[PDB]
Design a protein around this ligand. Structure first.
Ligand SMILES: OC[C@H]1O[C@@H](O[C@@H]2[C@@H](O)[C@H](O[C@@H]3[C@@H](O)[C@H](O[C@@H]4[C@@H](O)[C@H](O[C@@H]5[C@@H](O)[C@H](O)O[C@H](CO)[C@H]5O)O[C@H](CO)[C@H]4O)O[C@H](CO)[C@H]3O)O[C@H](CO)[C@H]2O)[C@H](O)[C@@H](O)[C@@H]1O
Ligand code: CA
Length: 582
């Protein structure tokens, strides 16, 4: 019985059943990290700047010692001040449990310390100095309510906690859980949210996500007015407003329709026999029908990824790509991997793989290129079609691969515990520290977990390489772009030699909106926020920008850099202060 005009309905973000609202549980429900728990600083990709959220400012004591000053007003939804202890607690608990927000912080942060009630101090580990990770883990730190979690641990194992009682939920964001069941999850605004004076209140009173079983059923809901804020794959999206005259839109009104989200991989499990062979993984890369699948299945909503894992859609990242290495390795104009079944077969043949009587390859060690599955969640129709196309080409070269589409939760379980064979999945996207962020996420064994244990922090494929570790530990030991560049170049050599997993395409930042009840959605025309997809980790400002149709509100005054009248701090200003602290 939600008030329609005060409720935003979402699609494409919650798939499968709600799980928990505990960022320390094996899985959590859409909306938890996004809306319930905010960071010290929120990175703004669109402006390359940082919103001071829970924190109001930083100070470098020296270039390796950063203090973060918590806003006095910053307060949990139960009224308990957010304090430096909350920041310490969150990170220490993640280290203890092997899971949780800020995973891997202890690798690059020496300590996090509460030097006063509203002052946290982060110190960079010197032995493997990395300024990017130092800044990422500190500025982006998410506190967690120590007074809440401690009570929980005295009562039960933290990992088993569901956090599903609305009246008990304690959050730092402007929303918390209102109600849920097998068919829906609903969030309600916290009207006396601590950030009310500084940021204003977000305009929707409720966020509601009906749980749709698949793309077509969600698409129907969208076409009939039942979804305001969508993060869906939609075939021929333009026809919604052209042909059908519906009041809906996307970021772009013409071709690509969507801004890029990141890099979609064909992930290949390194621990499986056959798939453990780099030659087999290389052959898989040549058997992906990149252009045909991206045009047919993906509607040109995204294009083929560069094998360097660098997102070359953005000109500033191109410098981090060794183009002559990539061109020399793959023999194409830009160094992308070409679809070529002849080469995939040749790679297999020269690695000693020979088709048995049933067509399926057997290695020189007797390893059969197996019954394997390629898996994506049920209902994700574009990825399913791509899986069918990839699997067919693999079967033709003697790699026995069939598709399998379990519920999201099952799919996520096998992905994170590393029991899959092949999957399509995401990685990371554009960022201040990008190409490093993707190498850290995809290639770093330190972020992985043993087979059978959940990891959301990275390296689902369980790639194991000590040299990459050394390279990342050196990559940003100084701010000199040249040092970073050279480390990226050696990593790219390693990627081509090992093919740990295949960077296939640039994922679309699925984002559609209806203007039936809500207006001023971000778009190319209204570029107020550059991560507006409802499922994105950084979607929350979107809710502060939109207005009810019956009562338009202006775009928030805090958006924009300090020099433009806003409160956001350019990444350039931060590195300037770092440099000045030497
Ligand atoms: O084109 C293909 C189809 O794409 C669909 O959209 C995709 C979109 O739904 C997907 O969303 C991602 C969310 O599933 C993801 O979910 C988050 C969980 O990962 C997160 O786990 C946390 C973990 O990050 C943290 O470290 O610790 C916690 C341990 O407990 C753990 O819970 O929980 C989050 C809430 O707390 C939850 O939101 O979050 C990702 C963001 O980081 C989302 O991106 O992303 C794809 C990216 O490519 C989208 O394609 C469309 O809906 C379909 O129509 C398409 O067919
Ligand atoms: Ca968050």
């Amino acid at each position: 019985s939600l008030p329609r005009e005060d409720t935003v309905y979402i699609g494409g973000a919650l798939w499968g059943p709600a799980t928990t609202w505990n960022l320390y549980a094996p899985q959590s429900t859409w909306g938890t990290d996004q809306f319930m728990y905010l960071p010290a600083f929120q990175y703004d990709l669109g402006r390359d700047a940082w919103i001071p959220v829970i924190a109001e400012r930083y100070e470098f004591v020296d270039d390796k010692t950063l203090r973060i000053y918590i806003r006095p007003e910053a307060r949990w939804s139960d009224g308990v001040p957010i304090t430096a202890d909350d920041f310490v607690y969150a990170l220490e608990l993640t280290k203890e449990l092997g899971i949780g927000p800020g995973g891997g912080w202890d690798t690059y942060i020496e300590y996090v310390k509460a030097v006063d009630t509203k002052v946290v101090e982060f110190k960079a580990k010197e032995e493997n100095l990395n300024y990017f990770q130092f800044l990422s883990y500190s500025l982006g730190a998410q506190p967690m309510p120590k007074h809440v979690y401690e009570r929980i641990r005295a009562q039960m194992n933290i990992k088993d906690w569901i956090n599903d009682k609305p009246e008990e939920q304690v959050v730092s964001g402007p929303y918390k859980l209102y109600y849920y069941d097998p068919n829906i999850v609903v969030y309600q605004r916290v009207d006396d949210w601590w950030g009310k004076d500084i940021f204003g209140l977000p305009r929707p009173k409720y966020l509601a996500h009906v749980i749709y079983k698949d793309n077509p059923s969600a698409s129907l809901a969208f076409e009939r007015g039942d979804i305001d804020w969508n993060g869906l794959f939609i075939p021929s999206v333009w026809e919604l407003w052209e042909k059908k005259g519906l009041p809906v839109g996307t970021w772009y009104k013409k071709e690509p329709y969507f801004i890029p989200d990141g890099v979609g991989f064909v992930y290949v499990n390194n621990t499986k026999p056959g798939l453990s062979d780099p030659a087999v993984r290389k052959a898989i890369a040549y058997a992906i029908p990149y252009n045909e699948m991206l045009k047919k299945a993906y509607f040109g909503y995204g294009s083929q990824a560069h094998p360097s894992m660098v997102i070359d859609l953005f000109e500033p990242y191109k410098q981090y790509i060794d183009y002559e290495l990539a061109k020399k390795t793959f023999g194409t104009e830009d160094g992308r991997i070409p679809f070529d079944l002849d080469m995939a077969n040749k790679i297999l043949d020269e690695a000693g793989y020979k088709k048995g009587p049933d067509g399926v390859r057997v290695g020189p060690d007797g390893t059969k290129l197996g019954p394997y599955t390629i898996s994506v969640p049920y209902g994700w129709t574009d990825w399913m079609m791509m899986c069918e196309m990839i699997a067919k080409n693999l079967r033709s070269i003697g790699i026995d691969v069939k598709t399998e589409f379990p519920d999201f939760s099952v799919w996520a379980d096998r992905m994170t515990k590393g029991t899959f064979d092949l999957i399509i999945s995401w990685s990371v996207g554009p960022s201040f520290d990008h190409p490093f962020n993707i190498y850290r996420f995809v290639l770093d064994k330190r972020l992985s977990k043993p087979v059978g244990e959940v990891t959301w922090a990275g390296d689902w494929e369980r790639y194991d390489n000590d040299e990459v570790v050394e390279l990342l530990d050196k990559a940003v030991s100084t701010l000199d772009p040249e040092v970073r560049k050279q480390a990226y170049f050696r990593i790219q050599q390693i990627i081509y030699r090992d093919m740990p997993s295949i960077p296939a395409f640039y994922t679309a930042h699925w984002y559609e909106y209806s203007t039936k009840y809500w207006i001023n959605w971000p778009s190319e025309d209204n570029p107020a926020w550059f991560r507006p997809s409802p499922w994105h980790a950084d979607a929350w400002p979107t809710l502060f920008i939109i207005s009810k149709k019956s009562d338009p509100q202006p775009v928030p005054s805090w958006l924009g850099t300090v020099d433009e009248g806003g409160i956001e701090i350019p990444t350039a200003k931060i590195f300037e202060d770092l440099q000045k602290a030497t």
